[PDB]
Amino acid sequence: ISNCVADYSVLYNSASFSTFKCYGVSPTKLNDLCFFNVYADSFVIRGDE
Amino acid sequence: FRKSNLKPFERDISTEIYQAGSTPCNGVEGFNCYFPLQSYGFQPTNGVG
Amino acid sequence: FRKSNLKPFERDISTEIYQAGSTPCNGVEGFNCYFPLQSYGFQPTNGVG
Amino acid sequence: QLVESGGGLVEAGGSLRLSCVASGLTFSDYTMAWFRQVPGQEREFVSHIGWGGSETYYADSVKGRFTISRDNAKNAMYLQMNELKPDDTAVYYCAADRGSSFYYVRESEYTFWGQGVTV
Amino acid sequence: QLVESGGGLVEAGGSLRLSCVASGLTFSDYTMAWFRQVPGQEREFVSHIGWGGSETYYADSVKGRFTISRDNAKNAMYLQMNELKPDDTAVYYCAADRGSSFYYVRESEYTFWGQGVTV
Numbered sequence: 001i002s003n004c005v006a007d008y009s010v011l012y013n014s015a016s017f018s019t020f021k022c023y024g025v026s027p028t029k030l031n032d033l034c035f036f037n038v039y040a041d042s043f044v045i046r047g048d049e
Numbered sequence: 050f051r052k053s054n055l056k057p058f059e060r061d062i063s064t065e066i067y068q069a070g071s072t073p074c075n076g077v078e079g080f081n082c083y084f085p086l087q088s089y090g091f092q093p094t095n096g097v098g
Numbered sequence: 099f100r101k102s103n104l105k106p107f108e109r110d111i112s113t114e115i116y117q118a119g120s121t122p123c124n125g126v127e128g129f130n131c132y133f134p135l136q137s138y139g140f141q142p143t144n145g146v147g
Numbered sequence: 148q149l150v151e152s153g154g155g156l157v158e159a160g161g162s163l164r165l166s167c168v169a170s171g172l173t174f175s176d177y178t179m180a181w182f183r184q185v186p187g188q189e190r191e192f193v194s195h196i197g198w199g200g201s202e203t204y205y206a207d208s209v210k211g212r213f214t215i216s217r218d219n220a221k222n223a224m225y226l227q228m229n230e231l232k233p234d235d236t237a238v239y240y241c242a243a244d245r246g247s248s249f250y251y252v253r254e255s256e257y258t259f260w261g262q263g264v265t266v
Numbered sequence: 267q268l269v270e271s272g273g274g275l276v277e278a279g280g281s282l283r284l285s286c287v288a289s290g291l292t293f294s295d296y297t298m299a300w301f302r303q304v305p306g307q308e309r310e311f312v313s314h315i316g317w318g319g320s321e322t323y324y325a326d327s328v329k330g331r332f333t334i335s336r337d338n339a340k341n342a343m344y345l346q347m348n349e350l351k352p353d354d355t356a357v358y359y360c361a362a363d364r365g366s367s368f369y370y371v372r373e374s375e376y377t378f379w380g381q382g383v384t385v
Contacts, residue, residue, distance in 0.1 A: 070255055070258060071254060071260035080255060
């Protein structure tokens, strides 16, 4: 993901997520600091893993 | 799923619901609560291994 | 099945036949030779986990 | 895994200090929380602290009363009470996790859990 | 895992000594073997040694010629040749396992395998 406005509000109001965990950064202070690229890695696994 | 490694020559037939997280299950089999007795996918078309 | 642990942010789509023992397989998928791409048993009647 | 200290009978208005010590975690890249247990009812959330202590939240029924803090020099964090109402007498549970979650109120978002404080 | 030594060009009738050193095994509760590799053909079995060396077997085409031995003081065993026919020039592979098998001739019954000796 590159060359766009990185709004995270969609990930905030959406209460159907079973897990939203953040590492190294705050789950809410993401909009303040920004970088070159955003990578989205999407796949399907089982709940046990 | 099991809390501790089995002592040699010990059989455990208990089918209690496993608590993987921190919320006790009390036998509900839901989120973060699993049934340890997994079945086997045995079909003639499987590979040798 | 894989020889070595995956380096972070590395994808391995190779479907080579795994050699678990000491006899090289050369792509036969027989005894002590396995196909690493295991499928998932996804059915609606599964438990939550 | 998570050994905790503190707790006891209080004078219903004084102050108390609770601690939770990690014995097998680095404690420098982990985020903890405080949860409350009441018999006959579900598990309640009270307090939460992020890495270092620069981003902390508190419950709506406890905001403004209790203070949270952490210190890496001993692999432990300190929770201090200031009101101790005769309604908050309950069972105290110390949680921890590698990261911080948006659904930080959910109990399922804390893989690690400690022992219990005196009811 | 299994580092082995020995091998080279021979005078076609002299003697040679081969060794296989275990670097990450206790070697006191493990059983090894010797297998032979020829290009264009399958893997062949030659020699086998049990715990200590009190129960050793040899191939029907090699019986009476080569001697096997082991010693735990250095985590290695010694294979010594006495004939070295111009037909046995092949690739040497050192195997090992926790136990000894009735189907000790089968290559699949040796989970651990070493490096190769010069052809």
